[PDB]
Amino acid sequence: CGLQQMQDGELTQGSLLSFMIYQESVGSYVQTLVYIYGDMLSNVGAAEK
Amino acid sequence: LNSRLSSDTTLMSNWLPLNANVLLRSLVKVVGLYGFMLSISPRLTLLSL
Amino acid sequence: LTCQRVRRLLPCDLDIHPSHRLLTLMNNCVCDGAVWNAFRLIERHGFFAVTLYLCCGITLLVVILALLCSI
Amino acid sequence: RPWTSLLLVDAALLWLLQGPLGTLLPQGLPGLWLEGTLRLGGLWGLLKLRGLLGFVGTLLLPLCLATPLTVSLRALVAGASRAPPARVASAPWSWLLVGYGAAGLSWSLWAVLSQVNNKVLMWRLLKLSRPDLPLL
Amino acid sequence: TLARAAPGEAPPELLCLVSHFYPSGGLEVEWELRSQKAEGQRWL
Amino acid sequence: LEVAGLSGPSLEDSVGLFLSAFLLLGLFKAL
């Protein structure tokens, strides 16, 4: 999608690279947040007795 | 009962040092990264969700 | 991009087990060192924006501490 | 049965809106919004009358308002300086296929997505961890 | 940049700039459709 | 002179349709 936008002229190469870096970083951070929160919940709830 | 008292208690607190650190780092960073990628391109930012 | 000068072979965060890591499209550019550079971010987005974002991130943790203290 | 009836009724409504009914409707974002509202109303009525809304109602609101809403968001981010958007019925079959796919995928994701015990146990753990507040 | 959609009405106004020519007089600007005589209001 | 035709949706258009449908169905569940 970013390559299509850049070809259309909406954003330049540097903007595309910066956005890809930032968006991949936030994707990784959000996946880590979700996984770690679920892991903590599972570990706490497995000790229900 | 002894198995509970010696293993489920370990499970209940087995992740704080790593999971807490990772969660807090990601929480600190995500807001700023989203702000940056909004500054570059809100269109691609909405796409990234 | 000077980050793409080297190929990242280790996980960006070393406290994450390798089996739990993600195979990223952009190696060595999405690592926290290459992204969260204070000087580069201040040059590119301004001092005020970076300071505000860091303050918001820190206030999230302050809110978590306040919630834990309400107990 | 219900899926074929939904497809037939949707096709009939789109064909009607393509004809003289569409000409009355305005052009642009309001035109698309009004077309979507009419589509949703027609589907809701013709399914309530035939008693097939028990499990297909969830898919109605997205399927009918996914095309207009999308367009609006674009005009709010990339700007409205571009040409006025085309109506759903007048658009080619690819847009309808993509809309069906989007509605189905969203429906499946929401089915998968729809905990209290875990939350209360975590709150209990926080209560137990309260004495360690200075260290945290 | 080519032009916008043409579902009916709303045609953009076309500007034709002829720059840095001498003498001022004798210039004839004509509008065509591609060959045919273009239709639309014209002025300078 | 460009004209409006039966152009197919772009990939970004498909992603936007999916996101809009997801948001709308979530809202319908909410209310």
Side-chain angles (χ1 to χ4, degrees):
Chain A
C1 301
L3 185 74
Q4 182 61 24
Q5 287 198 22
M6 186 186 70
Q7 290 180 348
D8 181 67
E10 303 178 11
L11 74 178
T12 186
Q13 294 172 353
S15 293
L16 176 58
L17 298 183
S18 181
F19 179 90
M20 288 301 300
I21 294 170
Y22 296 154
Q23 77 101 353
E24 184 159 27
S25 305
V26 298
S28 173
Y29 289 170
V30 172
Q31 294 178 27
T32 302
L33 284 170
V34 172
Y35 175 79
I36 298 291
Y37 188 71
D39 191 75
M40 295 194 313
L41 291 188
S42 291
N43 285 319
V44 168
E48 185 177 358
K49 283 226 177 178
Chain B
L1 288 175
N2 203 58
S3 301
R4 303 295 172 177
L5 184 59
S6 59
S7 182
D8 296 18
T9 62
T10 293
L11 255 77
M12 294 153 64
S13 62
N14 212 19
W15 32 255
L16 186 71
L18 183 67
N19 292 17
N21 172 26
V22 176
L23 283 178
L24 300 170
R25 295 197 319 250
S26 303
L27 276 178
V28 172
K29 297 170 189 167
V30 288
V31 181
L33 286 172
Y34 261 114
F36 300 146
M37 59 195 299
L38 274 175
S39 300
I40 296 173
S41 179
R43 175 170 162 175
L44 296 165
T45 304
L46 267 294
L47 224 70
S48 72
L49 300 174
Chain C
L1 272 59
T2 59
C3 55
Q4 56 171 11
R5 200 158 44 188
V6 48
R7 180 67 183 186
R8 186 70 177 174
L9 298 178
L10 317 174
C12 297
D13 295 332
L14 303 174
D15 67 331
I16 273 63
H17 204 272
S19 56
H20 295 65
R21 83 190 188 279
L22 284 165
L23 312 184
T24 56
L25 193 91
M26 309 182 66
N27 282 110
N28 202 87
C29 294
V30 304
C31 287
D32 189 75
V35 182
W36 280 99
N37 181 2
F39 292 77
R40 192 180 299 272
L41 292 174
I42 288 168
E43 295 167 13
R44 179 164 37 194
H45 302 289
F47 173 86
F48 174 75
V50 182
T51 304
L52 187 71
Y53 298 144
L54 271 296
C55 293
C56 298
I58 295 167
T59 53
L60 289 177
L61 308 201
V62 173
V63 163
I64 293 175
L65 285 177
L67 268 60
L68 177 58
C69 181
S70 71
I71 295 171
Chain D
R1 281 189 178 185
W3 301 108
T4 59
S5 64
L6 178 69
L7 293 175
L8 292 173
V9 176
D10 184 81
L13 292 173
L14 293 177
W15 186 17
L16 270 170
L17 294 169
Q18 180 188 3
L21 284 67
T23 60
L24 299 177
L25 305 178
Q27 296 179 356
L29 293 170
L32 268 177
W33 278 104
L34 295 171
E35 185 190 14
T37 52
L38 291 177
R39 187 190 197 185
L40 179 60
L43 284 167
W44 184 20
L46 297 179
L47 294 175
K48 184 179 178 181
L49 293 179
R50 292 183 174 182
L52 303 178
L53 192 64
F55 48 89
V56 184
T58 62
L59 184 139
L60 296 176
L61 182 65
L63 170 57
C64 306
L65 302 191
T67 300
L69 176 54
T70 293
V71 171
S72 305
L73 291 176
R74 209 176 191 180
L76 293 173
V77 184
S81 60
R82 297 181 178 180
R87 293 167 182 168
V88 179
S90 57
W93 303 346
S94 59
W95 283 86
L96 298 174
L97 266 66
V98 174
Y100 291 166
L105 192 56
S106 57
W107 177 79
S108 66
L109 289 179
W110 275 115
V112 170
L113 296 168
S114 65
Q115 300 179 0
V116 181
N117 201 339
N118 268 328
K119 302 302 186 65
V120 296
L121 294 182
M122 199 69 195
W123 176 259
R124 221 166 297 163
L125 187 140
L126 291 181
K127 289 190 294 183
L128 191 59
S129 167
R130 173 57 174 81
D132 297 328
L133 184 63
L135 286 172
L136 293 170
Chain E
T1 62
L2 285 67
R4 301 184 181 179
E9 300 82 34
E13 178 176 349
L14 320 184
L15 178 147
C16 181
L17 178 67
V18 305
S19 60
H20 292 79
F21 68 97
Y22 197 77
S24 59
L27 182 127
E28 305 168 352
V29 45
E30 66 215 11
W31 296 86
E32 306 168 359
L33 188 60
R34 304 173 173 176
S35 182
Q36 189 174 9
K37 294 182 183 180
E39 54 277 0
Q41 175 181 227
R42 293 176 291 278
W43 70 96
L44 311 171
Chain F
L1 180 65
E2 175 172 354
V3 307
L6 283 66
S7 59
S10 58
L11 183 60
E12 163 165 4
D13 293 331
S14 304
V15 176
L17 278 169
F18 163 81
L19 287 168
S20 164
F22 185 88
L23 184 64
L24 288 172
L25 184 47
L27 176 60
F28 170 80
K29 282 191 175 296
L31 307 179

